[PDB]
């Protein structure tokens, strides 16, 4: 989409190359005869002589004469444009421009079906470049590299005194590698440029391209590759550019999946107690008709997608899988237990269709505060698909948001319910039992119901924790566009610790495995009332009516899930 | 403007703090008697109870009740909400909430005329920070600082068991220092937080914030400062957050100025005699009514503007100031940097200009490029988006050797001058055909001998190809037309590595002090008494209003900011 200028002189004939599709400006005035106010152009039927305001159209100060051609040329110097400068002095003098048509096309998957700028939206243009972070040769490799096409319809002797170059910038060299289809090293991290060898006539050359980096602060995510026609007709002067065509790719980002998407594969380890646990997980996986891949003998699995492949990726701190400082900046808040993703959301008009990442930190910097490493936050922010949200999770001894918040599948409203821990519903549930007579039922050491409702230290300890969780509630009701009819509160008692940090009293029921629309909740080991645990009766009476089904286990599991449907390139960040 | 949630229990009365202007949610269902189906709220004339589906509003699963007050409190627990639950077979029970009003305002110059998000445009909201790069004491210092205000209207006993804290992130700490008005050192590069001391009643505290960094790749340009109202009523439990307000600043960028802006003050360097040079400069310098400050016995001067001050800047490799160890290339000098006048490209408007720097056409082993750090620095400043050109074919690598922009009274109000080897040959040929073809040039040579050298006529054809490439690049990326490109005669020659060099002194590298132009001497052919190149350039430039002189050729010219407020442009 970038050509050059053609100046015609009556003194000598001129030779020029016009690439088909490019509107080439013809200078018909700077080199005109001394006196004249007229000019005309009789061209061959293959030359489109466009003019902007024969008919002798006068030599306007600026008269934009542009020229394109229709049929590519195999004859070198065939289409002849002859000008007629007739002013007032003798029959007109005439100038000759012996042109030629060539067709250098660099096509790709810009239409995103599978301007030279990358645009987002249901209507835009752009190519997608996946990263090679997996171990798979031949076709299997051909199916995850991109496919650029270079067609060259040129005269037979055109490439005797012309040459083509395909080059990247010296900033993007290390983030992209290209192979010329056998597949061969063309450009790459050490070589910034390459010259090509193209025979005359029609010769199509297909390229394959891989990225070697994920988007970050140093790398926005856009790569550009350029083809240029360097005219080389004299061996004593440097080469000259006559045409340039570029293309822009965007590297696909790291996308994380929440607990509403249907499961695909589950995993586990061998602490030699699973028999009791794995026996219920194994039943659950086939309750939802899933696959349970046991593993015989801190990890988050997302998906990176292009129009041609949906390769998954693993992140931590095989064939269809993937991978993305250890010394310094190490704390307990750097774990992926401090990372969650909300379901698709709509906040004050804007639509977040892939979710909104959630990580926890402190409320205000101090000397004893803990934070997640800035490198990880910058990495997650560079992935503009899921804009992260900062919460408060430093009042806890561990430092993880998964202690108090979860999301469930649901068949109503936004199609999900936010489960939040609640110290205030446990006290209510205990008091409804004390005011009915059975107030000496034992809990869990072991303690009665009354001895927990008559402890004035635990009550303050839990009032503080409730004041802490309500802040996150308010944060989640404004940055997730939520409403009260979508929050369910699950009873949970807390106690404080070294450095007055919080720790759950009985094992959390908010950190639970959603291997489907019916799931696994850790045992409360709570009071028994009428042959049944009271906490269990309340959580099953709040969750089941939506349509879920709940089990209870005593208590590692990762549930690889289904990539989202919304194509990330159709979103407008 | 965050706030929190208040939960009411019939068992015990509840106390809460409601900051003014924040819509606070009230939980009237989670903790209600198990037999109720109806509820009502009687409150003092100050509590604005807002109910969205005593009228008996039933206990809907999501009946929402939000509260605000239309006043301020100086007494703890002075507004009492009494929620009247009505039992079906039981006399009504009633929860008590003892509210209080406190006002905590953190205001700044967000209206940009003097949401917690920084928005661009004529209708946006944001505050602007200027960088501390001047040697300016207190009186002038408070002139370029920011002015953030914090007003607190609280009961006298409120700040006994409550504490206020102002904090910055552990990333933006190194790029902002905070002073509290006597100015004192509080939150800055080494200290990330500060607990304040506020007396009860009315007490306004002003702050002054300065930045220490320019926008770059590592720093987008936005700095947030947060005020948090905590609660320390119990001495054993950890402190708890009750309210949060925030403000977002943007650091003003580095802006350059083109050759179409009026001059303010020229400069010079008496390295040599240059008596003639100085005379001519001062002459057209007072002719354009611009003061000529001389030096007593490569540097680009921009402007960092804010809604409170337009302090300039100086960039190199009072006033203002802004690296790579070494091994850099000559393409890193500032003769490679130019700025176009405001343009309108395909509907889009660039009202501060569009920067221009040259580099190679395609990377190679012998190619030379401008350092990546400088390009990233310029790209960080989104006001003037740079444009890459081709200048590697020269033996110096500077775009100033063929392009220039002049003032003009027509069309876009300017003309782009480009060097042209093809007009020098034309004028020489007209002067040979007319008869005076043995006039001597500048190793002296005649007109005929230059027109009959076949090594030069190829050296010049290559340069013409390169300059036409640059012309197409400048017509598409600057929205230009062929009625705005005046071509200036110039001949070139090739040297070691086949790089290019001007033959006669470059007349396209000119000093523009308004309608007066110091064009370097061409030392060229004389015809009928005057020089031919001079006659041509005075016949092409003068008609549109300019006036020319010919010195025998360092002068920098500080100028006028376009005054077009950038915060009104939307990049
Ligand atoms: Ca490989
Ligand atoms: Ca998680
Ligand atoms: Ca200072
Ligand atoms: Ca100052
Ligand atoms: Ca310059």
Author numbering:
A (entry chain B): 2 to 54, 65 to 125, 136 to 157, 172 to 216, 224 to 339, 351 to 370, 386 to 392, 396 to 515, ...
B (entry chain A): 2 to 54, 65 to 125, 136 to 157, 172 to 216, 224 to 339, 351 to 370, 388 to 392, 396 to 515, ...
Study text:
Citrullination, the loss of a positive charge on the arginine side chain to form citrulline, is catalyzed by peptidylarginine deiminase 4 (PAD4) of the PAD enzyme family. PAD4 is implicated in rheumatoid arthritis (RA), where citrullinated epitopes serve as important diagnostic and pathological factors. The active form of PAD4 is a homodimer, and dimerization greatly affects enzyme activity because monomeric mutants are less active. In this study, we identified GAGs as physiological allosteric coactivators of PAD4.
Enzyme activity also depends on calcium ion concentration. A PAD4 monomer has five binding sites for Ca2+, and its saturation results in conformational changes, leading to maturation of the active site (14–16). The calcium-binding sites remained unresolved, even in our 10 mM CaCl2 structure of PAD4.
